[PDB]
Subunit: 478 residues, 4 copies
């Protein structure tokens, strides 16, 4: 019929071609010989085996990285505009294999294909294009200094950069770190999460195809306590970018000073409050806060369970809020109709349910859902809680799964104080129609980023270092 | 009960000590010996006489600025941070003689003394201080160019800058043109308006005192067709900054192209439409809309007489606004209770009246006022027009006086399309509590500046760009590395 | 091993497909029906006829651009990042058809094909790609202001932009104006030079093909006094960008001021003196000072003919230079061995010869060349001059042709004063290994740009194509 | 010829300020403990100062926190006002310039006229400079895909902890207090234990100038106590440290084990000097000389090593020995002294044992070599010759009146040698050859490179970005 069925479609015939270590544009086997399994979070099944990299592999990776960054290097003499062209060529290859890549992100990470294809991958391509445009626009400056002097600065690449990311948005994270860093001229030694190194490894292929000189990007799959720690402590690594759990960041900053005091960056958790006001149109408020709390199986750090709602509407919202969760299609990620895929791990799976129990046995009125779904996979039903208070464990601890707490507040000053209670880290999503309330909240919110009625230049600053030069001149004249 | 007048007081009948041309930190008489009167718009009585500059005087002024800007010059070798120290020192003096400068301001422009003291002179001091901090923070860049090259850019002063400003905010205008230009290292030949040259001449005194090298700032009171025209057509002036009527704006650019292609900046008037949605606190909207329309005697490019009010509340707004006018205190600018002083001239005066007559004799419902006040000075009573339509003349012609027109609208697009109708130039104030309306309206407004729930005296980093030119240098290097 | 593996060539008698006015992504014919010829500067022969635009034509183009910039507009709602992709797509299309484009550039302006291919179109493609990147990186700011307020600024496009450019680098010039403007969201009404509009119109074809909304780019071939004058006086163009002679520049600003006070930008000529000190590698210096004086047939504002050499090396330099000219290959621009092409006009041609003679009849020592070459075309032989002094007409007037004048000098304070003396407009190139001389000079040269040990004339460029809109909101209580 | 004097020390300077400064109040250490401060020229005790510890550092933070809380005066203060305060602070410093330079010259043993004309010049200058930055710190409006509007605000971090050395007490204190205050932060600064006077004094000025209570807190004391108390406090948002790398490692480690606060480290580093034969031997010798002996050599911005090109290695060493040979070492308050004492006995010994080391390894001790007399920590101007990369005095850094003079031949040589450094590097090159100046300046792995001599990025570590994006009905360019 007129069914426009033809749309993005995954690929069950997806056989993982890239499962080895990527160093100096070559696919190597782990020095030890060890190999680690990669599992499909929707069926419990094993997708394939990947070469487990360790201390030794990290050394070679770093060696190629430093060589690729040396003064002779093709990566060091290459015009900046060319680095951009390469980031741009890479973006083109990502578009070409957009499906097979979006498939791994679905297959390997359990994220509903249509979402992996239309959201995640859009970002991957978007950021690669965007940063490709920054390469030759990174500017230094000439400074007017007292005295017969002429000083000026040049922003230069730090050198060898170590990167370590989580499993929330495997490809996206990998890109968000690769682009900025390459953009600035650095060389990379990136360690993807152990439960999601596929798309990362695939990018390695595209990178070599795009034309990046050997040694610029090195991808070493393996375990955190091993490879990730060998990086965070490696002596010949100038900087390190980490993003994941706070408890592990501490080990990173500490191993940083211990080693060689290399520059360090940590992208840590943080709670994600939401403050819906009575003046906001209930309908739109519900959907958005519902998508903001359930997106990416609710297990994404950029999500936020807690949802402060104004009393005048606390009634309806709760009811509407549960109707949605009820109709939410949870199924196989390859199914174009499923909205919620499985959780990433059994370890993760339990930590969620285990916290769902806490709530129930503490006053939280379970409005719907509450337990897992079936055999295999790691699905959990859309859980919505009611009558929640700040002293509960489900309100204190963040729920990294399909669980949304609905709280109630009366005064403004209130929510501001309640939502600001966060020990480092915070993101807010206010919903109003009142310029004043919006302005006040977005200001009083001790949050790194605020959204009003919805749920760049500062990026490539940590991937470059300043080099000032000052020259004595015969006589100075403005 | 313990109410004492701690309040600042306008020095009684100030003695105008400065009335001559200011060149090379020296006070000269007019080459021709000509002279022109300065008058009190509040009484219509003369205040003093000022030397009259002309072609020949402008010429000596340009020679002065030129020499003060040459390669060896103290002003050219001075550290940027020192120019900053000078702008700040000048700010100190303005603060010291703040009372007498606000006195001339009020005495020559007929503006309420307390306003000239707390608003105008606050700004004078503020902008001076502000640019002082900018002097050593103007940076250039280093660019990554393909090839084994290294290019960079310095931001250097332009040279001699001619400046011409109006009578609306004599001291503010003078300051806004001076600070940025000196800040960047230029030399100035500035021509105040013929009706308001005093406050400016006094600044010449403080400039010499502060420490500015001779020739850096040259002030020449005089007329447009002569003094101003000689500046615009001058073969030795590198840049000219003008603010005033668009009619004269055209002569300035033409003179420029016809003479030496000097750089040209034009600050022209324009309409300043107001939009009041029914969801805005009606009380605060009447005060603000009233303050933005009748401020500085309504005669100020930054004031918008026309006011679009939403039907749902048109009724009320018209009533609240007339009360405000009736209670509007209009008196001698030295009385600390006067909220409105006289219009600047008889010419201005007449233009407002005859224009007001039009409205009345065309449909507009004259809610109140409509004629002048007593004898002496150029005071006009707070007029308020209602049932005004776009087609009307008062609607198409701006009202540079104590006159406000209230119009009614229904849809949003309407207000927007209607308000947007203008020719090159537009400032706009909007009042709502609806974030969406504020946003739609703020973006859709073809204006250079938009205020949301406030008016404020209109017109940073973008300011000192016009007072400096870019110089780039690219060096061939052995090999380019990251 | 005799590797006759070659592969870079024009196109056999190219058929000029695009010769009509380009409005609203549509090819029109002049309202009047008038037409002007375009000629091959090498043969003197006619290449084709182009529709000649005038007042009326300009009006429609302005109308289409106007509509293309109005609120709801497709080009106005487009994401900035999308405007950028469009410029990148245009870059791609320019890459695909690079051969035909460089052919026209050569065939129409008379510049050696190989140079047009590897230089001019590299620039076109490079600039297009470059600005395609700036599109979503034009930021405004949040300003810490006094009181309980919050002010922020937005850099919006100006509106309808007229653009008028010369024949020196047809495609390069065109690109340099289009990219910055489109990159900022404006709409354009562009008028190429009467002697070189082909590459221009072809770009119109590519523009439509790339995806640009109709009305965004309008291209109108025609004459200066008519079409160019109607753009400068048009009551509905918000800004004009002109590059050409200072004499015409003067007229542009006047018309600007006498009409609607549109923004005006003038890219005028100027002198481009070079300075050569004994400490520089005489060999290298001669090679750079040579290309930079004979490049683009010497008729490139981005390069002067005057060269100040230090007494110590003046001798060897004069000989080193003459030997270079003597070995310069002038001939058909389609022949890959040719370095120098024909001058652009009969008019420009005579102006060069009359000027050469002048030098001869005034004392300058003609070391070589001094007259045209053969019949057909406007070629002039590499002409070098020795013993030249400032007071000489040739020294005072620019020699927009294949002619280098070599002036002698001794003290630094000297050259620095001589090089400077100029009425609005200066660019300088200095060769030395002395950080000191290089410094004193580069900071003393009243030039807009200065080259040290090289010679071949960003963020500030996309500033003239956008204006500032500052918004400020009143807020309950302000906190840092 | 009859002459006159004008620039002079505050006679028999008495120390009015010796307590801890918290909430614009002078408190006594909780423990009640007190520590001494000494004159490095004589060795005698100048006075005693209250000693802060974990519990004191605790009150300060409470003070700073409250002073940074929303409603606060300092948080609502127009940004232009923070600048006026800084400027008034610069004025108050100009007024008491003489006595401040006195303490700096009496506490750290630096020659008064330099402490007056140099050190204090920088204190006032940098205070004036940042005064001017306070209302010019901008965020941006970013064009975003979709119907959105996103903007950023550069806001102050909050509570900053500062720890500086004794090389330039006041300057250091100033360089760290200015940017931070300029950005709206509140401070808890800990001066070195051997030089707290000038700092504590500034405390009085800060209060006099009008800074609200709790914005700045000066807690003098020891590092393993006060310094660590700061580094680990759970309520300090950011920490700025400048000093030795060995302690830096403890700093970063501590901040990681605690609350993951931001950490900055201004650490050591060698300051090589390369001199070519083409540079003017005269200028070159005097410049390299002043650059290695300034502040008595005991200052990070001083580099012992001085690579000289063979062609002129001869004369350079001679002209240099003559220089050292005529350097006047005397009392800090005598207008003719060019070199005061070393800050400490501990630092004193180190310098000597390191001098003996060189002599005992091949170095050709051209002049000087030992201390001077009794009382004080003076050390005669030392100058080595024929030094090689392997020699200890060359590998390790000499923070005293000691200058080495290595020899070299090719450019590639010096570039490789001088470049050899494990994190941290600054360099000076002398030539009249643009190329060498370029090849070298870009090949040097230094944060800064000086050529023929020896801002905006500063106010960046004291603020964070807060991006906000609003949904709008429909977007238009
Ligand atoms: O009307 P308005 O009174 O508000 O201001 P205006 O436009 O008449 O005049 C404003 C300023 O422009 C000057 N001016 C007037 N005509 C001039 C001319 N012909 N050429 C050069 N300068 C001229 C005035 O003297 C004044 O300083
Ligand atoms: O050379 P230098 O010897 O002056 O450098 P240093 O690191 O010994 O001294 C610099 C500053 O760091 C402080 N400090 C010392 N050890 C510390 C520690 N363990 N943790 C926190 N603060 C400490 C000092 O008291 C001083 O204020
Ligand atoms: Cl004329
Ligand atoms: Cl006319």
């Amino acid at each position: 019929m007129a069914s426009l069925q033809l749309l993005p479609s995954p690929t069950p015939n997806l056989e993982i071609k890239y499962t080895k270590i990527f160093i100096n544009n070559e696919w190597q086997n782990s020095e030890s010989g060890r190999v680690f399994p990669v599992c499909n979070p929707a069926t419990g099944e094993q997708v394939c085996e990947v070469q487990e990299a360790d201390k030794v592999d990290i050394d070679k990776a770093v060696q190629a990285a430093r060589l690729a960054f040396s003064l002779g290097s093709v990566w060091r003499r290459m015009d900046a505009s060319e680095r951009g062209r390469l980031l741009d060529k890479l973006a083109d290859l990502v578009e070409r294999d957009r499906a097979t890549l979006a498939t791994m992100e679905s297959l390997n990470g359990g994220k509903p294909f249509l979402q992996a294809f239309y959201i995640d991958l859009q970002g991957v391509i978007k950021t690669l294009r965007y940063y490709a445009g920054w390469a030759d626009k990174i500017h230094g400056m000439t400074i007017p200094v007292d005295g017969d002097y002429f000083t000026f600065t040049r922003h230069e690449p730090i050198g060898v950069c170590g990167q370590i990311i989580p499993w929330n948005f495997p490809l996206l994270m990998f890109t968000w770190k690769i682009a900025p860093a390459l953009c600035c001229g650095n060389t990379v030694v990136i360690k993807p999460a152990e439960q999601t190194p596929l798309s990362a490894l695939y990018m390695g292929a595209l990178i070599k195809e795009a034309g990046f000189p050997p040694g610029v990007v090195n991808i070493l799959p393996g375990y955190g306590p091993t490879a990730g720690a060998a990086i965070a402590s490696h002596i010949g690594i100038d900087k390190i970018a980490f993003t994941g759990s706070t408890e592990v960041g501490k080990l990173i900053q500490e191993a940083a000073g211990r080693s060689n005091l290399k520059r360090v960056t940590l992208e840590l958790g943080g709670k994600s409050p939401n403050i819906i006001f009575a003046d906001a149109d209930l309908d739109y408020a519900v959907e958005q806060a519902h998508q903001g709390v359930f997106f990416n199986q609710g297990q994404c750090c950029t999500a936020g369970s807690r949802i402060f709602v104004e009393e005048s509407i606390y009634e309806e919202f709760v009811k509407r809020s549960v109707e949605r969760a009820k109709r939410r299609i949870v199924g196989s990620p390859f199914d174009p109709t499923t909205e919620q895929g499985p959780q990433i791990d059994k370890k993760q799976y339990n930590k969620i349910l285990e916290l769902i129990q806490s709530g129930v046995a503490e006053g939280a009125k379970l409005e719907c859902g509450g337990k897992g779904l079936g055999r295999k996979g790691f699905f959990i039903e859309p859980t919505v809680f009611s009558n929640v208070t700040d002293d509960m464990r489900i309100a204190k601890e963040e729920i990294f799964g399909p669980v949304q707490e609905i709280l109630r507040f009366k005064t403004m000053d209130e929510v501001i104080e309640r939502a600001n209670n966060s020990d480092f880290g915070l993101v807010a999503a206010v919903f109003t129609n009142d310029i004043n309330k919006a302005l006040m909240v977005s200001s009083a919110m001790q949050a790194g980023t605020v959204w009003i009625n919805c749920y760049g230049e500062f990026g490539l600053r940590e991937y470059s270092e300043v080099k000032t030069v000052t020259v004595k001149i015969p006589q100075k004249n403005s």
